[PDB]
Design a protein around this ligand. Sequence first.
Ligand SMILES: COc1ccc(Nc2cc(C(=O)O)ccc2NC(=O)c2cccc(CC3CCCCC3)n2)cc1
Ligand SMILES: COc1ccc(Nc2cc(C(=O)O)ccc2NC(=O)c2cccc(CC3CCCCC3)n2)cc1
Length: 191
Amino acid sequence: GLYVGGFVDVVSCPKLEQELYLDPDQVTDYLPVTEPLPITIEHLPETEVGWTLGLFQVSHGIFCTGAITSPAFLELASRLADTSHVARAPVKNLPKEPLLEILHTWLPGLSLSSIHPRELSQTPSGPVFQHVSLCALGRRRGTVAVYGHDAEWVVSRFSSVSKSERAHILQHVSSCRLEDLSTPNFVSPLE
Ligand SMILES: COc1ccc(Nc2cc(C(=O)O)ccc2NC(=O)c2cccc(CC3CCCCC3)n2)cc1
Ligand SMILES: COc1ccc(Nc2cc(C(=O)O)ccc2NC(=O)c2cccc(CC3CCCCC3)n2)cc1
């Protein structure tokens, strides 16, 4: 299993409009998120690859850490990172950690899916957030996602996240029993 970490765009995934990007201040009252949310690809519910391990308001935005736990996803991505010329083409030559480099460049955006802001003000009936997605398109804010084998290393890549903020994030990550999370539903698109 891998960890992912990054700042999210906050998005409502509207049916009619093409996209709505929320100001983070519109949702910070519902933070932190300390229960697992599905992590999917490009907001597709049949592409669960793992589970969030916390969403926290820090000084420079809303930071998410997550676990990529899907066996079919990790095995496929790991095989492509070692053998696929296409996957490696946008990456620097001969990376020490090809799987981490490939995810970093192909899935650089984290997006947090929220209810519409009209609901956000206020007293929503049920959960404010539906999922976090790894995205290839549609990034607005700065910073990109970091993938790694150890959460502390992932979070400490972000120079804009302070030592106190990182310790707070890492406390929540450590309190999560990875074994207890159900298997995400990702299926290998080759099957
Ligand atoms: C782990 O490997 C994969 C391979 C393909 C998919 N999805 C997919 C599906 C189907 C299908 O259904 O027909 C067709 C195309 C697919 N994927 C893309 O066009 C694409 C574009 C940008 C980023 C990614 C994420 C992936 C890229 C490779 C490194 C691991 C991360 N995928 C998802 C995961
Ligand atoms: C839906 O069916 C498929 C077919 C092939 C793959 N991927 C794959 C496989 C194998 C294999 O097996 O050895 C080797 C390389 C593969 N693909 C990638 O490394 C890669 C990386 C980034 C994005 C994509 C999307 C890809 C899908 C549509 C054509 C254009 C670009 N693919 C993924 C899904």
